[PDB]
Design a protein around this nucleic acid. Structure first.
Ligand SMILES: [Mg+2]
Ligand SMILES: [Zn+2]
Ligand SMILES: [Zn+2]
Ligand SMILES: [Zn+2]
Ligand SMILES: [Zn+2]
Lengths: 44, 48, 184, 79, 115, 257, 55, 64, 43, 49, 420, 576
RNA sequence: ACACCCAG
């Protein structure tokens, strides 16, 4: 469970009870990374 | 201020000067003696 | 026949609405029997008169042998028996239509089948059928000597408004004032 | 006896009789006419109506309160 | 949502049938050739090749619905000629036409490329 | 045995387009060859796109849309490979498809143009035709596009990305000698490039015993198959469809005996 | 709730509007009734839950 | 947002011609001659390059 | 607008098209009730 | 106010955005110009009732 | 005393994008200005950052070939909405009748009018309450007692679906557990159909201080049958059929139009400016510059555009000889064909299609709910009950209003008539 | 309160008892489909797979319903529920074992809607009886409802994103009611005005005007491609009208095969001259305008909306009254299929060249407008000085307004007649007006010659400013340009003053559309709830709910309005 | 509840 910060774009490894808080730049907007399972896109 | 509108009602002899907000205005050119006051020197300045 | 229609129709508007199309099913009888209009026919004029009389008795709207019922039966199908006697007369059938004996028998049977099929079916909600048919062409006129005419007139006419908007008369002149502009 | 209503069969009696007959035959009622392979109960009921074999009596209610019992085989089929 | 797959216009999966022959009872010696998963590409040439046959009386094709992929070819012939033989001769003449057209095209490529 | 005898004359044969004339042929045969050019000629195009990471401003399945429209040359490969739906592998194999890998990361400050040269294919002779080049996505520094794609075999009926033809022009009887079209004012309409009429004249006279006999083609490819290979594969493709119909028809005639 | 298998919990099919048990597929009870508002008001504001329940 | 890979109407390749079209316009060419130099004869391909706006230039100004 | 005087004055910006955003930012709203069947201020 | 197009893009804000709208609870709210009858002016009407 | 700067400044914002507005009937100009607010395009350049609850973005927004001189000022050049379309006004096989559009399928497969549909699902946890506790967590069938027919497998351990995961109807994207006064399960679900791929997942702290989340679901909406398409002159219509490029008619140089509209849509509406735009577009696409469609430009009339078109080998009235796409025969009439700016409207058939066999009923009426958002039933209104009376169908009217809506039984006394 | 719950439109009585939300209904956007019959409707697969029809299991269909249960709710067509005889309902998406999947007699299987199913199709302003018509379901894979084009007129549905409801009957009694009372073929002729409410519209009507012309001829291959779409065809190719130079069939011969039975009808084309009925060529037509159909074969005449449209006594009306509902249904589909596929060959279009007039017509239009402007200026000069005598019944100002409007209306009519005089036969604006498919003669006049005088609230453009229509004019200007007359056309382009006056008549038409609809809907409501209980009883007396005689016979004759026609009485007009 | 909006 790792999040991408909206400003510095660095991983944060936030747990289930850790408040939303960037460990590097101090920013409160997080984005989840893309999932490891791969989705098939048809080219149509 | 340019937004102030002054209206002369000659057939009633009334002069109404309005200043308050809410009036709706649009710009127009000025014609005096059947000639535009917008000469060519204004267009060349506005073209730069 | 003529004197009754002069009372009913004073304006001479002969375009009326009737169930069986007499001028067309005669044309049907000419084509299905291959009737040649040039050759003389073999249809007895008294057979036409007895055929129309039998057909007129066979179309019933008000059923019953009571004199009150018979008077209502005669009045209900009055205008159709005007048209039936006019179109199926002996002179027109011997000169213009030139139907044969077998074609005339088919025509009488088909008129009876078509008239009995055009009778208003009991149970039909004609009240809701009428007002749908009278409010559907109320969306095809424009709103407002001027005169109220359209949706405001329809709104006024079915409300029975005790004060109108544009009340008017149509006064006609009886004597010499009609023919003379001075007395008018 | 003493029947004053229309001998012809109206469109509304054709709708209800065919509706009732199709519902009955779908509920394993005995079919009254031989069938050449029909399965839809609407088409079976139409075949029963054209053969004048529907076992239904139409009861028409006059406005005064009296009623007339008309059997479907006694009415002229409009179709 | 209701979008059909794009390959249903030219595949036959388990259940359909490429060509069926139904006899037409309206006139003698007529057949209704029903071809599945095709379009106007084959319907037009088959109708035209059957029309050039002087001993075939009727030849026409229709598509009942452009959203479906079925064509219907009705062939009516002379009473001494089976409609099924007319369809086979129409296909055989078209194959011999296209194979010769391909061979004549291949020659013209060689003649153009050599100078 | 009532098949007419067609002849071919070729006027222009370039790298991108071919001009040829077919004579002594019905209109329906010439029209069917034209629609086989668009819909029944198989080529190889990307159909299966799998995106591992896409940080571009273009979303994932819009990159996949632009990848499928990129034409891949299949001048001698499309005959060898069979369709993926008729193969023996469970999903995809090199015998019935080719694999494309894309891996572009932008570290320079300038905008990185992810073009078609960056599509690396395992098959040495199935490449993008431009390898300027077809633009896929523009990348700002810090944006990564990494994906792997598979390319199947298909024709234009399934999708427009499998269309080798890029503008076939079909024209017959440019002088309007058959009156198939009726000009209201014939003097206004410009003469066609294949017309053989004088300047003062504008429309050929009516031909009672006439049929459409001469056809003009301007088949142009967008890459993929060459101009001559499109027509040669089309006439084989229409022959294969007619041979398949004849086999099934003879089967059903034999069944109904 | 199910007659043949009372122990199994009932799954809800809001699209089909009925209570279905997931073993034998029998529909138990009656049609589901939405507890939300029918419009998108005839109800009032709720009592503030932290404020003590008065009138 | 970005130049289409194929022409919408006929299917000609126009995805490789957008960069050359901007280069010709920067070299003081009229838009009519710039399209004619790229090989677009039909007006369907001409409207693909002429009417296209490059929104990907404004999209790339924002940080990823 | 109070604290029953006016209602429906502030709207969520119609962020569907740039033409729609500009049209919504330059909108005039009349106080005539839409249940009134009068047509004198609508022409 | 008074920011260049490059500085607006760095702030993740569109330069083409005309503005003119409030942001309340994260929803963009626009004030529609309400129209009233003009004040301070004597009016004569034609009430036919 | 005063003079107008330009007379085309009397128009508004959405009416300024109409090419040749003076050649149209006025109800047509009003209808387009309504539809101009519904055209799909890139609505803002930072749409990849904003998380709007509705957001429609077109793939290939093109500037109009026939433009107005006010388009440089409304920034329609920079942020257009619509694609220039080769439009042939022909009466084809019959699917363009009554304001419909026959659309080239092979064009649509190449990116014609294909757009994404961004939808956002905000949700916040409410820590307030004397007993209730509301925590983002992946639900478990053993603990939660409020689930329904859906799959709780696409979630993560945090309670949020990850980006790049496909979703369908009745799918869970928020793991949302609230403690009972152990815990009951209420969560946000995808609406009916609405299949797509989760684009990005965003978590912050909102204004209330609680934990906030926002998921943007992205779905590609390929144009299909039923999508509403309108020109810039009020010529609205729906895509009647999708023919492939080999089936559409083609010009002798090989141009198959992308859109075919009815010839019968013109005369009762008199959208002559649509005809002028479709003929100016041929000149603009051939000569090379973007054409001028200023509303009151006296130096541009029909005869001047017609003379320019005659210099490029086309008919001076804009007609061309189209060949039939099926049989290859020449069409006897000469079809008027040229580039016309068309817009795709947000009114889409996948957002409107709705059906209901049997579903949830209201708490008060025990009748089907209102609208597709909650799987409701269509209203058999007073006007419909009225028409079934005139038909005479009594059992069908009874079936609609009693059997198929809310059947119920009550027990009634016989002395009084009160419910027992 | 309780009163607010029970009153008005959203109350309990009007909003929940007189009309209420129902199950087994669907709504989606409609699209055209001319390849269906008039009684067929296209249904999407997801709509048909979502909602079911309860079928009672009988030994006649025990095998078919067992197969539908085994398919389940995943492969269309299939079943969604098994309603048992004791009332238990078993859902088929949750039960894997076949222990309770066996069907016996008396069970109900809720199978999916399939082909041939009967539905009610309804357009949302349900004005008349022909808006709740019953169709047959045909599954066509896409996301829209499909209608034939001949049913668009009774619904008043264009295909511009209209959307219409689809109600599916549940019991077998209600299916039979819809099948014998409210199907599409049984509602062709309305009892409102005893004319066919349906007809031929737009592309099919324009091309049938072209297909029945005298100059159209079809080749050998074109006829047998056209005859493939004829459902009622005998199968025999008719003898060509031209044999020896080349086998050619006229267009009237192919339409003669379309016309069913042996019906007889005489109609007239829209362009029939008045003097042809009394001239020497009465029964032979130079313009080919006298439509006669004899023995079911078209002999002469060009068909239009006055022969194939909604007009009373037209060829469709004759077909319904002779053959029946089922044959007329095939008559509608065979017209639409044959004509459209010939329209693929002939083609039809509209363009700029269909609006351009020659230099002589533009000079004649400009001369008439200049003369009319000089006439109005003369009237104003005669009215400024006290020289105009007021007509009786009105004041001088209304006399002046009547005289100016008379001149300007005569100017529009004269420039209108000058514009359509110089329209060629190949002009496509004329091709869709004389056929009556769409548009009218005033629309061609507005496109080509002049827009005409534009009125707001009956009168001309009022003096909104102080005695001025616009600031660009002088005070007290009663001329045509200042008061709203548009001397330009749509093709030439309107001047900015004329454009603003055009936006006023256009707005006033839109204000009339919104106000009239809100009023007429209340007129319609009141008019019928007063008499909705009026019913023809079984003694053929029209009575209301409380059994009071309204009419002794319905319509004073006892005949329904469906089977009555317009006729002529031969013994009323002639003299003695 | 209100706004906006689709169709006639
Ligand atoms: Mg509409
Ligand atoms: Zn950070
Ligand atoms: Zn393989
Ligand atoms: Zn192109
Ligand atoms: Zn009691």
């Amino acid at each position: 469970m790792i999040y991408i910060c909206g400003e510095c774009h660095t991983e944060n490894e936030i747990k289930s009870r850790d408040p939303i808080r960037c460990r590097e730049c101090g920013y409160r907007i997080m984005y989840k990374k893309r999932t490891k399972r791969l989705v098939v896109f048809d080219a149509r | 201020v340019s937004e102030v509108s002054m209206i002369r009602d000659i057939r009633e002899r009334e002069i109404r000067i309005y200043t308050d907000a809410g009036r709706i205005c649009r710009p127009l050119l000025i014609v005096e003696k059947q000639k535009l006051l917008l000469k060519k020197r204004h267009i060349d300045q506005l073209k730069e | 026949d003529r004197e009754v229609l002069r009372v009913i129709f004073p304006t001479g508007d002969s375009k009326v609405v009737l169930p069986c199309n007499l001028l067309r099913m005669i044309w049907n009888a000419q084509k299905i029997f291959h009737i040649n209009p040039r050759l003389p026919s073999d249809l007895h004029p008294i057979k036409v008169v007895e055929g129309v009389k039998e057909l007129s008795k066979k179309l019933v709207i008000v059923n019953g042998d009571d004199p009150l019922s018979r008077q209502a039966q005669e009045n209900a199908t009055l205008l159709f028996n005007i048209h039936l006697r006019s179109t199926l007369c002996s002179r027109r059938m011997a000169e213009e239509f030139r139907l044969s004996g077998e074609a005339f028998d088919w025509l009488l049977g088909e008129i009876e089948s078509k008239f009995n099929q055009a009778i208003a079916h009991p149970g039909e909600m004609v009240g809701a059928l009428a007002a749908q048919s009278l409010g559907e062409p109320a969306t095809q006129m424009t709103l407002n000597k001027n005169v109220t005419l359209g949706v405001p007139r329809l709104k006024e006419l079915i409300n029975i408004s005790k004060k109108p908007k544009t009340p008017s008369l149509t006064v006609f002149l009886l004597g010499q004032s009609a023919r003379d502009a001075e007395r008018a | 006896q003493k029947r004053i209503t229309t001998p012809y069969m109206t469109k509304y009696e054709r709708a209800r009789v065919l509706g009732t007959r199709a519902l009955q035959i779908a509920m394993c009622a005995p079919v009254m006419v031989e069938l050449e392979g029909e399965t839809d109960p609407l088409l079976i009921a139409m075949k029963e109506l054209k053969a004048r074999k529907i076992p239904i009596i139409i009861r028409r209610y006059l406005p005064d309160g009296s009623y007339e019992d008309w059997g479907v085989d006694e009415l002229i089929i409009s179709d | 949502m209701n979008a059909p797959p794009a390959f249903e216009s030219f595949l036959l999966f388990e259940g359909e049938k490429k060509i069926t022959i139904n006899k037409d009872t309206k006139v003698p010696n007529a057949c209704l050739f029903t071809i599945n998963k095709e379009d106007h590409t084959l319907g037009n040439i088959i109708k035209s090749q059957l029309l050039k046959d002087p001993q075939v009386l009727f030849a026409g094709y229709k598509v009942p619905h452009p959203l479906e992929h079925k064509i219907i070819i009705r062939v009516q012939t002379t009473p001494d000629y089976s409609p099924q033989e007319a369809f086979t001769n129409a296909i055989t003449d078209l194959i011999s036409e296209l194979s010769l057209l391909e061979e004549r095209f291949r020659v013209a490529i060689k003649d153009k490329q050599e100078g | 045995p009532y098949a007419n005898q067609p002849t071919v004359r070729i006027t222009e044969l370039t790298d991108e387009n071919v001009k040829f004339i077919i004579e002594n042929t019905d209109l329906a045969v010439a029209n069917s060859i034209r629609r086989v050019f668009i819909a029944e000629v198989p080529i190889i195009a990307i159909d299966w796109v799998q995106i591992d990471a896409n940080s571009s401003v273009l979303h994932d399945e819009f990159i996949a849309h632009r990848l499928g429209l990129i034409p891949l040359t299949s001048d001698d490969i499309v005959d060898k490979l069979q369709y993926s739906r008729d193969c023996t592998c469970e999903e995809f194999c090199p015998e019935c498809s080719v694999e494309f890998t894309l891996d572009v990361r932008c570290n320079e400050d300038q905008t990185r143009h992810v073009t078609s040269r960056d599509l690396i294919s395992n098959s040495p002779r199935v490449i993008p035709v431009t390898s300027d080049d077809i633009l896929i996505v523009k990348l700002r520094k810090g944006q990564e596009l990494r994906l792997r794609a598979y390319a199947k075999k298909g024709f234009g009926k399934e999708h427009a990305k499998w269309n080798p033809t890029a503008g076939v022009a079909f024209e017959y009887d440019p002088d309007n000698a058959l009156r198939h079209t009726v000009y209201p004012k014939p003097e206004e309409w410009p003469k066609s490039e294949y017309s053989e009429l004088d300047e003062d004249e504008s429309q050929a006279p009516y031909d009672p015993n006439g049929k459409p006999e001469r056809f003009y083609y301007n088949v142009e490819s967008c890459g993929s198959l060459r101009p001559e290979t499109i027509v040669l594969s089309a006439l084989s493709g229409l022959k294969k469809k007619l041979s398949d119909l004849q086999t099934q028809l003879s089967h059903e005639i034999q069944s109904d005996v | 709730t199910c007659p043949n298998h009372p122990d199994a919990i009932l799954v809800e099919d809001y699209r089909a509007g009925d209570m279905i048990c997931p073993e034998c597929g029998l529909v138990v009870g009656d049609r589901v009734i939405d507890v939300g508002s029918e419009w998108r008001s005839r109800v009032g504001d709720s009592q503030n839950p932290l404020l003590s329940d008065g009138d | 947002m970005i130049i289409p890979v194929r022409c919408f109407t006929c299917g000609k390749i126009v995805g490789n011609k957008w960069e050359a079209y901007l280069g010709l316009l920067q070299a003081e060419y009229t838009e009519g001659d710039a399209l004619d130099a790229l090989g677009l004869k039909r007006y369907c391909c001409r409207r693909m390059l002429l009417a296209h706006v490059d929104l990907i230039e404004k999209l790339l100004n924002y940080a990823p | 607008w109070g604290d029953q005087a006016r209602a429906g004055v502030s709207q969520v910006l119609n962020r569907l098209t740039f033409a729609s955003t500009l049209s919504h930012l330059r909108r005039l709203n009349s106080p005539i009730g839409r249940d009134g069947k009068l047509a004198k201020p609508r022409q | 106010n008074g920011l260049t197009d490059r500085d607006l893009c760095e702030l993740n804000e569109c330069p083409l955005d005309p503005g003119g709208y409030f942001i309340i609870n994260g929803s963009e709210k626009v004030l529609i110009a309400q129209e009233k009858m003009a004040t301070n002016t004597v009016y004569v009407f034609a009430k036919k009732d | 005393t005063h003079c107008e700067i330009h007379p085309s400044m009397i128009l508004g914002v959405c009416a300024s994008i109409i090419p040749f507005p003076d050649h149209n009937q006025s109800p047509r100009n009003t209808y387009q200005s309504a539809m101009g607010k519904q055209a799909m395009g890139v609505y803002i350049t930072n749409f990849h950052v904003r998380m709007d609850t509705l957001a429609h973005v077109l793939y290939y927004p093109q500037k109009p070939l026939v433009t107005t001189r006010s388009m440089e000022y409304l920034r329609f050049r920079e942020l257009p909405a619509g694609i220039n379309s080769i439009v042939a006004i022909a009466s084809y096989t019959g699917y363009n009748q009554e304001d419909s559009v026959i659309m080239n399928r092979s064009a649509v497969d190449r990116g014609f009018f294909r757009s994404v549909f961004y939808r956002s699902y905000k949700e916040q946890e409410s820590k307030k309450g004397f007993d209730q506790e509301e925590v983002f967590e992946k639900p478990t069938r053993e603990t939660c007692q409020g689930m329904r027919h859906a799959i709780y497998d696409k979630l993560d351990d945090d309670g949020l679906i990850a980006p790049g995961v496909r979703v369908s109807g009745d799918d869970v994207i928020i793991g949302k557990t609230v403690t009972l006064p152990t815990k009951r399960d209420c969560s946000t679900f995808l609406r009916t159909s609405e299949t797509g791929i989760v684009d990005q997942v965003m978590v912050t702290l909102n204004q209330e201080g609680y934990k906030f989340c926002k998921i943007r679901v992205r779905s590609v909406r390929i144009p299909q049958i039923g999508d509403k398409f309108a020109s810039r002159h009020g010529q609205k219509g729906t895509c009647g059929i999708q023919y492939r490029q080999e089936d559409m008619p083609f010009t002798c140089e090989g141009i198959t139009p992308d859109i075919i509209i009815n010839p019968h849509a013109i005369p009762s509406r008199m959208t002559i400016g649509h005809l002028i735009e479709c003929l100016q577009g041929k000149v603009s696409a051939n000569k090379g510059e973007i054409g001028d469609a200023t509303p009151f430009n006296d130096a541009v009339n029909v005869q001047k555009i017609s003379n320019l078109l005659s210099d490029y080998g086309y008919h001076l009235r804009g007609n061309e000889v189209l060949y039939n796409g099926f049989t290859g025969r020449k069409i006897t009439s000469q079809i008027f064909i040229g580039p016309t700016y068309y817009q795709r409207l947000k009114h889409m058939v996948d957002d409107k299609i709705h059906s209901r066999a049997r579903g949830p009923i209201q708490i008060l009426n025990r009748q089907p709910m209102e609208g597709r958002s909650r799987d409701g039933g269509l209203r058999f209104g007073e006007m419909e009950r009225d028409c079934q009376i005139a038909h005479g169908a009594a059992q069908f009217l009874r079936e609609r209003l009693f059997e198929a809506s809310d059947p119920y039984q009550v027990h009634v006394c016989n002395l009084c008539g009160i419910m027992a | 309160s309780l009163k607010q719950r029970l009153k008005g439109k959203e109350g309990r009585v009007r909003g929940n008892l007189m009309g209420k939300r129902v199950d087994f209904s669907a709504r989606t956007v409609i699209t055209p489909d001319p390849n269906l019959s008039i009684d067929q409707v296209g249904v999407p697969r997801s709509i048909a797979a979502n909602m079911t029809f309860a079928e009672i299991v009988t030994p006649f269909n025990i095998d078919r319903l067992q197969e539908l249960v085994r398919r389940g709710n995943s492969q269309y067509p299939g079943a969604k529920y098994i309603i048992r005889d004791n009332g238990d309902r078993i859902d088929l998406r949750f039960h894997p074992k076949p222990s309770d999947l066996h069907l016996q007699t008396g069970y109900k299987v809720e199978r999916h809607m399939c082909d041939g199913d009967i539905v009610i199709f309804n357009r949302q302003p349900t004005l008349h009886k022909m808006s709740m018509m019953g169709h047959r379901v045909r599954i066509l894979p896409w996301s829209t409802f499909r209608l034939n084009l001949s049913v668009t007129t009774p619904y008043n549905a264009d295909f511009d994103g209209d959307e219409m409801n689809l109600h599916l009957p549940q019991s077998l009694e209600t299916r039979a009611e819809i099948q014998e009372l409210a199907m599409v073929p049984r509602m062709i002729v309305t009892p409102q005005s005893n004319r066919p409410v349906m007809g031929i519209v737009q592309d099919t009507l324009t091309a049938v005007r072209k297909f029945t012309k005298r100059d159209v001829f079809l080749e050998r291959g074109e006829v047998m491609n056209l005859l493939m779409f004829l459902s009622t065809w005998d199968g025999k190719v008719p003898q060509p009208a031209i044999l020896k130079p080349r086998p050619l069939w006229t267009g009237k011969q192919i339409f003669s095969l379309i016309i069913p039975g042996h019906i007889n009808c005489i109609r007239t084309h829209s362009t029939h001259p008045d003097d042809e009925d009394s001239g020497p060529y009465k029964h032979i037509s130079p313009g080919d305008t006298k439509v006669v159909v004899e023995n079911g074969e078209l002999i002469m005449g060009i068909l239009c909306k006055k022969s194939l449209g909604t007009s009373a006594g037209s060829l469709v009306h004759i077909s319904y009254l002779e053959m029946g509902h089922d044959i007329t249904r095939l008559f509608y589909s065979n017209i639409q299929t044959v004509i459209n596929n010939w329209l693929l060959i002939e083609g039809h279009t509209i363009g700029i060249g269909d609006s351009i007039a020659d230099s002589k017509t533009y000079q004649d239009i400009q001369n008439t407008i200049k003369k009319a402007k000089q006439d109005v200026i003369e009237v104003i000069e005669k009215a400024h000085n006290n020289e105009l005598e007021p007509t009786p019944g009105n004041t001088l100002r209304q006399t002046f307004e009547n005289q100016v409007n008379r001149i300007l209306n005569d100017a529009r009519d004269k420039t209108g007649s000058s514009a359509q005089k110089s329209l060629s036969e190949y002009n496509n604006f004329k091709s869709m007006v004389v056929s009556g498919a769409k548009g009218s003669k005033i629309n061609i006049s507005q496109v080509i010659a002049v827009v005409g005088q534009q009125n707001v609230e009956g009168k001309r453009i009022p003096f909104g400013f102080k005695h001025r229509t616009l600031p660009h004019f002088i005070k007290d200007d009663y001329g045509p340009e200042s008061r709203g007359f548009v001397e330009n056309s749509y093709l030439a382009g309107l001047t900015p003053t004329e454009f603003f006056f055009h936006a006023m008549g256009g707005r006033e038409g839109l204000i009339d559309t919104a106000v009239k609809t809100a009023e007429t809907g209340y007129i319609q409501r009141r008019l019928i709830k007063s008499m909705e209980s009026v019913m023809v009883k079984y003694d053929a007396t029209v009575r209301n709910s409380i059994n009071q005689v309204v009419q002794l016979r319905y319509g004073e004759d006892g005949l329904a309005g469906e089977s009555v026609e317009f006729q002529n009485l031969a013994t009323l007009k002639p003299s003695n």
